[PDB]
Amino acid sequence: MSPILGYWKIKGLVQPTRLLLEYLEEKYEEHLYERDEGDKWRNKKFELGCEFPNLPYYIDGDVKLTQSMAIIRYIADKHNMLGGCPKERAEISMLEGAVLDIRYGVSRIAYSKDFETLKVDFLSKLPEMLKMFEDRLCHKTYLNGDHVTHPDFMLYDALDVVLYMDPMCLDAFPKLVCFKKRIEAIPQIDKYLKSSKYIAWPLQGWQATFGGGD
Amino acid sequence: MSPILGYWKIKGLVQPTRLLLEYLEEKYEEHLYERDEGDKWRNKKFELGCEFPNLPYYIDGDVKLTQSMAIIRYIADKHNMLGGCPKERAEISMLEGAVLDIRYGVSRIAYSKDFETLKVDFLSKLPEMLKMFEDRLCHKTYLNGDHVTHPDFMLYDALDVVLYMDPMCLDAFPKLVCFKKRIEAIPQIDKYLKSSKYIAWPLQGWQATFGGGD
Numbered sequence: 001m002s003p004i005l006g007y008w009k010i011k012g013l014v015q016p017t018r019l020l021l022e023y024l025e026e027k028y029e030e031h032l033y034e035r036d037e038g039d040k041w042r043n044k045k046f047e048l049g050c051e052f053p054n055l056p057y058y059i060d061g062d063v064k065l066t067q068s069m070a071i072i073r074y075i076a077d078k079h080n081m082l083g084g085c086p087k088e089r090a091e092i093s094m095l096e097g098a099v100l101d102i103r104y105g106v107s108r109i110a111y112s113k114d115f116e117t118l119k120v121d122f123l124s125k126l127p128e129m130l131k132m133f134e135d136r137l138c139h140k141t142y143l144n145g146d147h148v149t150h151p152d153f154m155l156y157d158a159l160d161v162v163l164y165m166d167p168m169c170l171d172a173f174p175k176l177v178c179f180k181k182r183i184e185a186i187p188q189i190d191k192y193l194k195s196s197k198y199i200a201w202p203l204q205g206w207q208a209t210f211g212g213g214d
Numbered sequence: 215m216s217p218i219l220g221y222w223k224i225k226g227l228v229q230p231t232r233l234l235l236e237y238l239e240e241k242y243e244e245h246l247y248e249r250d251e252g253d254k255w256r257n258k259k260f261e262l263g264c265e266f267p268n269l270p271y272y273i274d275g276d277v278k279l280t281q282s283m284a285i286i287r288y289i290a291d292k293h294n295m296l297g298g299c300p301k302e303r304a305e306i307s308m309l310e311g312a313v314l315d316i317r318y319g320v321s322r323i324a325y326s327k328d329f330e331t332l333k334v335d336f337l338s339k340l341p342e343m344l345k346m347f348e349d350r351l352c353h354k355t356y357l358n359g360d361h362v363t364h365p366d367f368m369l370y371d372a373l374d375v376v377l378y379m380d381p382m383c384l385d386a387f388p389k390l391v392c393f394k395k396r397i398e399a400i401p402q403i404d405k406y407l408k409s410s411k412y413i414a415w416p417l418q419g420w421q422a423t424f425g426g427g428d
């Protein structure tokens with residue numbers, strides 16, 4: 001009938017996936033759990049019949065998946081995006097992980113009581129990671145060349161998130177600033193960001209010291 | 215000539231990969247950085263010509279990879295282990311991530327000043343995660359059935375590590391205890407664990423409050 005994507009009504013681990021979906025113009029319904037609906041989730045966690053109960057979850061009627069990275073890869077795999085040979089598939093997983101180093105580096109410290117200080121540490125390292133992507137892009141339109149791949153959306157999500165921790169972390173990385181704008185210009189993405197379905201905030205769980213609240 | 219696998223002379227993010235290598239009986243040399251050799255690494259970090267300088271790194275002469283998960287997947291991809299169709303490839307990435315929830319859950323708290331207290335929290339949740347694997351195994355010899363897949367080694371590494379945090383976390387999970395023993399009985403793995411190449415300790419960086427030291 002139509003695949004279902006379940007997660008908290010926040011950006012978190014699933015935002016890049018939503019972006020990929022719209023880009024592919026894939027049909028999908030959403031199970032959005034509000035901050036006061038942990039009971040509704042705890043009442044459904046073991047009912048869906050998922051192998052490893054967790055959020056997010058993607059039910060395809062053909063499958064019952066639960067790891068965010070397995071879900072994003074599965075979707076792209078359906079559209080033959082992921083590789084073509086070991087070497088290319090590896091290149092794409094390398095991009096994946098390097099963005100995760102940034103995205104996860106934020107999730108780690110966010111939520112913590114010492115966030116305000118840990119922030120200093122993470123931000124002092126951010127430039128070295130950003131640089132790797134800035135160079136990559138110096139001779140490629142997208143992360144993997146002329147064509148889009150799911151890591152492009154992962155990187156976009158990461159960029160969106162760090163700009164909130166520090167509005168200036170991109171000054172010094174013009175290629176990254178263009179890339180952020182180029183992704184937003186994709187007809188499908190432009191349409192999505194201006195739509196009712198776009199979850200602009202929060203970045204993390206509503207409880208996080210960073211990216212939380214409303 | 216022969217692929218090179220570079221990393222700190224510890225288990226860390228690369229142990230499951232070493233296990234996979236031996237299992238496949240793949241030829242490979244190692245660049246092992248000792249705790250007093252950060253200079254040697256900082257002097258090589260930008261020389262290898264890797265796209266995203268980091269540890270671990272896998273140089274195939276055919277490729278220059280750096281994300282631990284991209285490296286383990288690449289190796290198995292060379293041996294046609296990873297899938298056969300989207301659905302199977304997804305199932306295998308789901309297993310990946312679920313083990314990482316355990317392995318990374320340890321790395322997160324290890325290294326911290328509050329480790330001793332965070333330990334209580336992580337251990338109180340460990341059972342729920344362990345249970346998912348115990349059930350999976352109730353009707354399958356390995357994680358993906360009758361045949362081995364790289365997540366099997368990831369899970370073995372995870373098991374090895376938690377048994378140090380709490381020697382009793384496996385009491386109550388007999389299938390998991392057998393699985394741990396079954397992996398150790400693979401001719402290739404048995405041979406490796408008894409060899410000079412096996413890095414038994416440390417689990418994390420020598421600095422970690424947990425898994426560190428000598």
Ligand SMILES: N[C@@H](CCC(=O)N[C@@H](CS)C(=O)NCC(=O)O)C(=O)O
Pocket residue numbers: 012013045053054055056066067068069311315
């Ligand atoms: N490694 C998993 C982690 C998932 C996860 O931690 N999800 C959180 C939200 S970001 C959820 O609250 N877990 C629900 C649960 O464990 O019941 C993934 O990549 O999906």
Ligand SMILES: N[C@@H](CCC(=O)N[C@@H](CS)C(=O)NCC(=O)O)C(=O)O
Pocket residue numbers: 097101226227259267268269270280281282283
């Ligand atoms: N997400 C990366 C992280 C790698 C990483 O953090 N490696 C640590 C050791 S566990 C190393 O010290 N990094 C070396 C560096 O950043 O120069 C991966 O999966 O490989």
